[PDB]
Design a protein around this ligand. Structure first.
Ligand code: CA
Length: 223
């Protein structure tokens, strides 16, 4: 997250960190046994870390659980990043509490102008690299479709939406991928991609979760 602020320990109870000897992506807990993240974050040997704040020190409240299976969307395209969504089933059910809670799936899509909260342990600099120890937060509005399509270099599909600031300075970034975009208490987006980070006229692009609710439910129910 670039230009964001320190969230505060466990204030984002649904935030997850995907780990393979190091933090490589974020995710969102949607129920005691399932996490939603980005398909481009797929990898074998994933350990899910819940209740995290400082990802480099054990502070208490953390729950480390191995992934028993990762389900990348069948129509995911690595070239365009269309359908950049993945479901991870935990080997064991997480112990839900005040610091580890699930986030609700949307019943309808969010409209332009809606304010949302994006979070993660990704790069905090537009130029160069600097990874934080603690979870970062950023409030950003969903942009209109016309502005989204006019500013994006690559193709923006109906399964994506833009969020952020056209003036630059505030955006999600490398390492935040797979993370949550929550608006009105519902998970509306997944950090997917962008052109650089916090650049002028280059807002972040996210996976539009409201288009995958049925798929999420059907997949979880049959696994
Ligand atoms: Ca920790």
């Amino acid at each position: 997250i670039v230009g964001g602020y320190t969230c505060g320990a466990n204030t984002v109870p649904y935030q997850v960190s995907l780990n393979s000897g190091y933090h490589f992506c974020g995710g969102s807990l949607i129920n005691s046994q399932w996490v939603v993240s980005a398909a481009h974050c797929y990898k074998s040997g994933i350990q899910v870390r819940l209740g995290e704040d400082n990802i480099n020190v054990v502070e208490g409240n953390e729950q480390f659980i191995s992934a028993s299976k990762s389900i990348v969307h069948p129509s995911y395209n690595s070239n365009t990043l269309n359908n950049d969504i993945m479901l991870i089933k935990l080997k064991s059910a997480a112990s839900l509490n005040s610091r580890v809670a699930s986030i609700s799936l949307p019943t309808s899509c969010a409209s332009a102008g809606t304010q949302c909260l994006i979070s993660g342990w990704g790069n905090t600099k537009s130029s160069g690299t600097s990874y934080p120890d603690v979870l970062k937060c950023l409030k950003a509005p969903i942009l209109s479709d016309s502005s989204c399509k006019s500013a994006s270099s690559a193709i923006i599909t109906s399964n994506m939406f833009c969020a952020g600031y056209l003036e630059g300075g505030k955006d999600s970034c490398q390492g935040d991928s797979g993370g949550p975009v929550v608006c009105s208490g519902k998970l509306q987006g997944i950090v997917s991609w962008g052109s650089g980070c916090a650049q002028k006229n280059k807002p972040g692009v996210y996976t539009k979760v409201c288009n995958y609710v049925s798929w999420i439910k059907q997949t979880i129910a049959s696994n």
